[PDB]
Symmetry: D2
Subunit: 396 residues, 4 copies
Amino acid sequence: GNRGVVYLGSGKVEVQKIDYPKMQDPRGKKIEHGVILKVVSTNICGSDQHMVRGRTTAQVGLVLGHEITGEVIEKGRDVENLQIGDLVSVPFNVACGRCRSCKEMHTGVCLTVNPARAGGAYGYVDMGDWTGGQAEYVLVPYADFNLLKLPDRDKAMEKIRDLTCLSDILPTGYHGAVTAGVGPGSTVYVAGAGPVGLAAAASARLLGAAVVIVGDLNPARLAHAKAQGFEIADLSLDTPLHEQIAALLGEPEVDCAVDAVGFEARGHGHEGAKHEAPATVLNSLMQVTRVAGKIGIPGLYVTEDPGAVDAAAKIGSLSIRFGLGWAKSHSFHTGQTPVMKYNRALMQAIMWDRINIAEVVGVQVISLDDAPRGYGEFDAGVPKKFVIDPHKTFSA
Amino acid sequence: GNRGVVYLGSGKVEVQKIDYPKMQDPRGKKIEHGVILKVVSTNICGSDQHMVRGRTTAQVGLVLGHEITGEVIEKGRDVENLQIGDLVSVPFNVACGRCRSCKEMHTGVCLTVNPARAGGAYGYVDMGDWTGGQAEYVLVPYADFNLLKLPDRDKAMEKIRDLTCLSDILPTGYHGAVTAGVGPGSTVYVAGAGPVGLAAAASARLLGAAVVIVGDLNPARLAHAKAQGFEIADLSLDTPLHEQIAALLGEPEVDCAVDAVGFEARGHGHEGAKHEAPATVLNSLMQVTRVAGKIGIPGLYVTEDPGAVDAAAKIGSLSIRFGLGWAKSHSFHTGQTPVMKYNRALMQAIMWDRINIAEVVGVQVISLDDAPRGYGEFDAGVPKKFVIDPHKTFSA
Amino acid sequence: GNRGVVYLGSGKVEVQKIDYPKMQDPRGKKIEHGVILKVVSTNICGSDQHMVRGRTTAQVGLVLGHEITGEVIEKGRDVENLQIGDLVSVPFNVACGRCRSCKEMHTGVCLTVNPARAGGAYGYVDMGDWTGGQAEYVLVPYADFNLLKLPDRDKAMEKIRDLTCLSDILPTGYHGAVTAGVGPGSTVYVAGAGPVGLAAAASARLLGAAVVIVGDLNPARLAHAKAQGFEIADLSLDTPLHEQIAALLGEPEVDCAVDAVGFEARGHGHEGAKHEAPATVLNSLMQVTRVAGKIGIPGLYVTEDPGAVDAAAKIGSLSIRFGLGWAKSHSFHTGQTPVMKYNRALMQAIMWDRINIAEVVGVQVISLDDAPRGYGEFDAGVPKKFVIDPHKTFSA
Amino acid sequence: GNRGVVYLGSGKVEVQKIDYPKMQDPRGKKIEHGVILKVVSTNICGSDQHMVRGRTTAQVGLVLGHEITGEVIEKGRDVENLQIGDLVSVPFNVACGRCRSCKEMHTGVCLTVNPARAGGAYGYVDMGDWTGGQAEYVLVPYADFNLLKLPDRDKAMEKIRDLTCLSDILPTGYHGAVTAGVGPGSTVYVAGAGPVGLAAAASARLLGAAVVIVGDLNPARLAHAKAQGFEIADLSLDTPLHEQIAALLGEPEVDCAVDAVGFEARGHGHEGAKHEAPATVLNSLMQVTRVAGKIGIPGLYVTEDPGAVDAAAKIGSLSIRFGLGWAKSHSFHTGQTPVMKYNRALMQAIMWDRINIAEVVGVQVISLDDAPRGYGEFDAGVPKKFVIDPHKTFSA
Ligand SMILES: NC(=O)c1ccc[n+]([C@@H]2O[C@H](COP(=O)([O-])OP(=O)(O)OC[C@H]3O[C@@H](n4cnc5c(N)ncnc54)[C@H](O)[C@@H]3O)[C@@H](O)[C@H]2O)c1
Ligand SMILES: NC(=O)c1ccc[n+]([C@@H]2O[C@H](COP(=O)([O-])OP(=O)(O)OC[C@H]3O[C@@H](n4cnc5c(N)ncnc54)[C@H](O)[C@@H]3O)[C@@H](O)[C@H]2O)c1
Ligand SMILES: NC(=O)c1ccc[n+]([C@@H]2O[C@H](COP(=O)([O-])OP(=O)(O)OC[C@H]3O[C@@H](n4cnc5c(N)ncnc54)[C@H](O)[C@@H]3O)[C@@H](O)[C@H]2O)c1
Ligand SMILES: NC(=O)c1ccc[n+]([C@@H]2O[C@H](COP(=O)([O-])OP(=O)(O)OC[C@H]3O[C@@H](n4cnc5c(N)ncnc54)[C@H](O)[C@@H]3O)[C@@H](O)[C@H]2O)c1
Ligand SMILES: [Zn+2]
Ligand SMILES: [Zn+2]
Ligand SMILES: [Zn+2]
Ligand SMILES: [Zn+2]
Ligand SMILES: [Zn+2]
Ligand SMILES: [Zn+2]
Ligand SMILES: [Zn+2]
Ligand SMILES: [Zn+2]
């Protein structure tokens, strides 16, 4: 059998028995290029929280999870590179490797796996209805294209809390930093101290950044970031962000900025911080990024948000002070991360002890039975990254 | 003496006697690195029209003009590369060549020539108060860094209507196309059929584009674009832009898109087209650019527009459907063109007859006395690029 | 049945009855991801001439041909994107789409299709033993990754002489130009006026180059290059190449250079040009490329050349004046073209009439029975690109 | 007065009284855009050792030194950005900031400071005859373009052993790594464990490399590289380099390779390593770099080497196995480092404690009187980077 985390509506999730995976696409067409995995580790993301909070078009009954690490237990006949028993990291993007986007390495926007729009992902709104992987077992299509084979079992399993971050958050923070132009000696501001913002800060550090400033309103997440060796900015203070940056750096701007918040952003200041203001991060990043800088935006912005602040925000239309970014010659880089572009190199960085990602993001391993409470604690703001071990493969 | 085009407020300009240029900066500090030019050709830009329409903070008394081609008649002692008599193209950006931005080739955002913000330009709001060049004579500072020496007099003067476009519009259209990722075989949509949109289309063609579609509401400019060999889209029709693109290409999207309109954009449709809606072009480009595409934005967006449609638009804040561009993984590239990055190669393209820019943009040479009427005709929408010859150097 | 061109050693080729293609790799392992094509057009390359001249370790009995355009007449069970009857362009590289090289777009060096080294190709020495396609029928593996679907039958077949260049020579010329940094306004020197050098020149022109100088010692090919609109340099003259360039450009260097000759290069000068001197082109490109320039090298250099001038050259070791290139800060870009990187955009350039590649390279369509005489005429230096139409599909 | 290190021919150098610097170029033409520095730190380079060994056309009497850090004590009338007392890092390249190369950031090949060829440098053969700076005082031309202002006196002087590496070796190591494609998770091989190879290794580590293998035949330098945290390969062993790499990585190739040796390279193996063989490193890097990799070559190769192994090598012509590199699709990146491209970011990496460059390269501070013994110890292979403090400014 199988069981997984199901969205029930009204901010609730629950573990339920679900169908065992089949070798077919979501439209029921049998495939020979996929594998069925026994899930080793499967995480909870901020994107899942957006869905569970009712800020997307997600429907009741949705099986969640797009951050999978697992063992191949079955394979189709068009799977040349994986053997039964192999341990693999699964990119959250469902990609075919047989379309223009995939061939050009734009694996976040594959043209064939989703009938409604480009781009596919597991257990995710508007992403092709590929079943989620916060579960015991899951299907991965186009296995020879998507999967990253991990090192022999023993090496890999010792670092499983780090390697479970390769499915999404480490490559996502990395993509945010790279597309914001971070490199050796850069000064960087990362808005957001959730797991993706922390991964972006760790990635900026791995890239050689001179200093990373991580901003948030949540004081537990700021304390965590500071303890991990980053500088911080507290957006709930009345002190403007540019003054908090100037106090740390000697100038009110950074070389590079990353938005790791997205469409549920809060305003700034004692009062501002209390209310949602979806364009706040974009507007602040134009203010604090130096001229000709690049703004990397891994934070999610959607086409429909039923709980947004106004009619315009309900269809993703925000009041952005674009003239400011224009006057400073800023570039803006957005979208789902093409995880496959970076996951192999990041695996090598983890295996050679060049990054301590599980420590930086606050990995906490929980059972599948503890997933609903993990969602609740994460929603409350704890500075953790919940990693489910469904079969008690490594946390007995 | 000297005379130039002076902004008088209330949509009026007039030629007036102005001071002869001095070898000093706008703060009165003497400089040895500049030259004084006798102006050979000096054009009128859409940016000037924004100022003359009262859509910026420009003050009465402003001498206009930032598109200069001229002859060196005086030089300071820190000018090693120019000789009296040399014919030069002047980039519209005032850049020092002695700051981080300039050294990194971000010459549109020089850090030292403007006390108020990065970036300088002649006769332009918020750009360092460097005197404009729609005039008989003008100072160019940091001459060894900024100026592009043109071919020996005779060769260059035969193509002066083409070469006068190197100060701004050809490099600007080019920057729009390059930053939108145009190359050999690309399909391109250019919003705007004014001189910059036409230069972007010509630049896309020079870059090897398979096809360029130029959109506008002005039927004279669309007829011009069509006669120049481009495809067109008429935004005043009720037929949606994506359907007009699909009728030409077989799909409702292009590979690359350029915004050559900016902050006075009109809405689309029979009724829409009649009223201003500043976020219209940005929103439409996210709709018609394919996933993972790049949107190049040479069109001007400002920090303050006194005549905007609403309070938010008066400080450059627009209602942009950013969630759409995010869902499609779009990148956005903005700002003043770094003219020096591209003007030498574009000069070679002009001299070797690889681009016919004066024909494409509708160059029309006028006297300095005819500048106010040139402004009026340009404002009315004629499909021309007005080029003043102040001393009757080549149009007797 | 099937027939194809077979290499017989001692400079001879002959059309022979060969086996009908099978759905298997070169080792006999069955594959269900390939297609069998009915060959529509299939060309003869300069690489085939190196093999036929005995300048490689190609073995007697080799079926030649790696420039195929064809119609899908049989597909494996796991092919998702091709239908029977589709017309397709086949990149000359045999690539899997399932390894690190392919995922990173380095499809000229696929890691799994060739047991001996990275990189695969049809009918080619050290390329994995994939059967050549100067034949009636041919297998293409991993069809959903390699094949480029051509437009609706009719439009496509009208331009088949141009579209047949997409399998190799147009993307190759293009790769040489792009990796040499060619763009709008560039000055370019292309060494070699065979079909690949002519395609490099046409590609440089499509990229916007101001002027392309094509060098060769073969008068017919130089006259052809002139007729097609390029400048020329005749290496059989005693006039040094840099003087020839200076007479055309006013300076003895170009911005970009492309080696479209490879390891059978001749020396320069009246006497020099009569004798092989394999480092001649590499050495000359360092002399005529401007400082900080890039030298794109599509011309083939091999690890073993049994007929080379000396012991070192038989092992691919050449006396290259590297200190000159180093002193000028040159970069060198080499290898088999990754055809899939550029073929789709180049297809759109052909279909929209932006490049007349068949005319530029001198396409001459012939039957399969005329292939051996075509090889002979090509070996003698005719300025033609031989395109075989094996079933007389379009050349009746 | 002034004193500096003078090359006397026959492998000797001596400190002599030399002229005080003058505000003029090497031709005697007065300039008002330069500064005269009081030298704070000034290092000895492997390039100086090539000259002192008689392996270049350097002439007897040359004042050596191109690695200067100093205090502005006199400025020309046209210097805008430096004040008396400023502490500055001097890039080793003499660049004008006013030519095509400088504007495009190719400051290693400036077109105007050297009459004989592009590119200038202090105290260096074929570099324009700009006076060397292993001395008490030195002129720097075009000060507003070349100089990098260091942080407030106190912070800066505490880290002077690290900051003295910004003039050449840290940016050089960095350039070699970046142009070899090094980034987060890369595997890297650096040929050469002198100060530049050690700086390349430190730069690769700062860029995020998973592991760096440093090769040399000199045991002291290998032991140093190990102590500093890198992996090593000993080329004096009979064990082939690819086997040494395979023992460390599990595969006989690296993602990226850097040649930090240049034209006095030794062969490999117990016997081989005792003899000069100048193409050894180039040939070995093609063997150990993975397909489609990039080979960064900061190691010097010259147009004339009077002491080379053979006639061809005396003219910079080497028997390089180019067919191997071609077969593997390698690119080769060469030339003098454009120090200004990277020095400011590397300064911030030093100031924020992200790189411990002085420790890694083995900085040993000495007096000007000890320079000749420093040259001798360095020539004998000590694992040190000699930094002269001519006025005992920080090393009392
Ligand atoms: N692009 C991709 O591929 C991708 C992949 C993963 C997650 N995401 C998106 O990344 C974003 C972050 O994910 P997460 O897991 O870290 O989510 P999260 O909800 O745990 O973290 C967001 C953080 O932003 C903070 N925040 C709110 N307003 C702020 C403001 N004005 N300034 C600074 N911080 C502010 C919150 O307090 C919170 O700590 C989400 O939008 C998620 O959907 C994108
Ligand atoms: N970035 C730079 O360096 C730079 C340089 C030059 C000019 N500019 C800016 O470029 C823009 C164009 O300059 P120009 O000289 O061509 O100006 P212009 O005013 O002559 O042309 C703008 C055109 O846009 C059209 N337009 C309005 N709404 C439209 C819509 N929704 N879709 C399509 N077209 C629409 C107008 O009808 C008009 O023809 C201006 O904003 C100008 O300030 C920028
Ligand atoms: N990298 C790739 O993917 C790739 C693809 C196709 C072909 N190739 C190689 O491209 C090269 C050109 O292919 P082709 O079909 O045009 O070959 P070709 O043999 O028909 O043309 C080579 C031309 O070089 C000329 N030549 C010889 N010495 C010269 C010199 N010193 N200077 C200038 N010209 C000189 C010859 O006279 C000849 O016309 C060959 O080496 C071929 O193997 C590489
Ligand atoms: N491109 C630039 O801007 C630039 C700047 C500085 C120095 N350089 C050049 O960089 C090179 C290194 O400079 P350095 O100061 O470290 O010099 P160095 O002479 O102190 O070091 C070179 C090292 O290479 C070793 N070596 C010799 N043969 C070898 C082989 N086959 N494999 C590995 N190691 C081998 C030597 O034993 C020596 O330790 C020199 O050629 C120098 O001229 C270039
Ligand atoms: Zn996620
Ligand atoms: Zn796909
Ligand atoms: Zn303008
Ligand atoms: Zn500047
Ligand atoms: Zn070929
Ligand atoms: Zn492959
Ligand atoms: Zn040096
Ligand atoms: Zn220069």
